[PDB]
């Protein structure tokens, strides 16, 4: 997938480490734009060894790439909300200080974990409301017409959390999983 073809929020089920590396590589090497990756994860599971094999930091054409990848470990929806605030700050400042194009890829893995933790610390109502507010915010952010700075959001989920998707092709459950809920009510598309 190329940045200019990304939807506001895209679900990516169970990407291989090599395909994720390839995605990062081809998108952050694009010329005449400044592309950044914010990798937000509940586990610190960025595939660093594989990334260094496929994108060696000793090759000059890759230095730029390592400069523009940002790592965060995010344990709950409150922290994700705060990260979203920081990203909005960056974007807003970039647009203001512009009145070169900045392209941000927000990649979130483990969102179902962050949700579960949040709804142990507070009500299901509170966590649904925080999830809602964050995702709707990210969509409006990604939808901004401003050319100088943009954001696109990718959500990684294990494929077992998206059976409703695979069933549509073509079990009893106790409600939707977070991934299915987002697939139905918040994401623009799902990419194999």
């Amino acid at each position: 997938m190329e940045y200019e073809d990304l939807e506001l929020i895209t679900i990516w089920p169970s990407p291989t480490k090599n395909k994720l590396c390839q995605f990062i590589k081809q998108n952050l090497s694009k010329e005449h734009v400044v592309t950044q990756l914010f990798f937000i994860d509940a586990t610190s599971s960025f595939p660093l060894s594989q990334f260094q094999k496929l994108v060696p930091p000793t090759l000059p054409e890759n230095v730029r790439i390592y400069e523009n990848i940002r790592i965060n470990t995010c344990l709950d929806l409150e922290e994700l909300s705060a990260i979203t605030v920081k990203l909005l700050q960056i974007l807003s400042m970039n647009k203001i200080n512009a009145q070169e194009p900045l392209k941000i890829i927000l990649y979130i893995n483990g969102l179902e974990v962050m949700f579960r933790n949040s709804q142990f610390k507070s009500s299901p109502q509170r966590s649904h409301e925080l999830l809602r507010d964050t995702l709707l915010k990210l969509r409006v952010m990604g939808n901004d017409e401003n050319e100088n700075a943009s954001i696109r959001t990718l959500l990684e989920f294990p494929k077992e959390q998206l059976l409703d998707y695979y069933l549509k092709k073509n079990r009893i459950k106790n409600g939707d999983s977070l991934a299915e809920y987002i697939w139905k009510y918040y994401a623009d598309s799902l990419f194999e």
């Binding site: 506001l8 299901p124 915010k137 952010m141 939808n143 409600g175 999983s177 977070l178 809920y181 009510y185």
Partner: protein, 210 residues
């Protein structure tokens, strides 16, 4: 005589002239309301499970001719996507209008000073505002705020003459992730305000009235 003074004789024009716009149902939604009723439709609510607008809903909105425009309050960031924008529409897609508080503030300004409000949507005012669409009400929030929302939309219709179409998700949405929140969950005040409530259920898509 009192009888003479109170005799009222109306020109036929009165019965076919109106300061208000009415919703034109696409054939997907005909055979639900009678003729007269479908000629008097001002508030329509649709309940449907799809995140993106169904075909019926899309056809309800591109009812645009010449200078007419529809204001779409795009809480969901779908209608106003670059690749989805239409000439017959004006869009409100803003961080100040994705919660019911900001929504109500925006509509209140639209009523008070339509120019000031429409400037927020990047709009040239050589257009009649034909309708307002709000998608999706399920993301809002309770009853007092929805009563307020309905009242402001009703005032907007009274003043500007626009029709109103809103959408919500079915009950499934309100069940929440893994049912932890446990045929739509909107206040009966709001719903009682509607002229027509459509429900789209789906192998195939049927549209029933409620």
């Amino acid at each position: 005589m009192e009888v003479l003074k109170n005799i009222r004789i109306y020109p036929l024009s009165n019965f076919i002239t109106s300061t208000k716009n009415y919703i034109n149902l696409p054939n997907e939604l005909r055979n639900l309301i009678s003729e007269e009723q479908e000629s008097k439709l001002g508030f329509l609510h649709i309940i449907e499970s799809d995140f993106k607008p169904s075909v019926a809903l899309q056809k309800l909105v591109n009812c645009t001719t010449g200078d007419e425009k529809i204001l779409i309050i795009d809480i969901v960031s779908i209608w106003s996507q670059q690749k989805q924008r239409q000439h017959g529409a004006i869009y409100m897609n803003s961080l100040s209008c994705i919660n019911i508080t900001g929504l109500i503030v925006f509509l209140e300004l639209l009523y008070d000073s339509p120019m000031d409000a429409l400037r927020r949507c990047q709009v040239n005012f050589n257009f009649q505002l034909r309708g307002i669409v709000i998608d999706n009400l399920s993301f809002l929030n309770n009853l007092s705020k929805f009563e307020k929302l309905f009242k402001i939309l009703r005032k907007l219709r009274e003043f500007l003459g626009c029709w109103i179409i809103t959408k919500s998700f079915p009950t499934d949405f309100y069940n929440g992730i893994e049912n932890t929140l446990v045929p739509t969950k909107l206040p009966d005040s709001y719903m009682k305000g509607m002229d027509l409530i459509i429900y789209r259920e789906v192998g195939r898509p049927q549209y029933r009235r409620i």
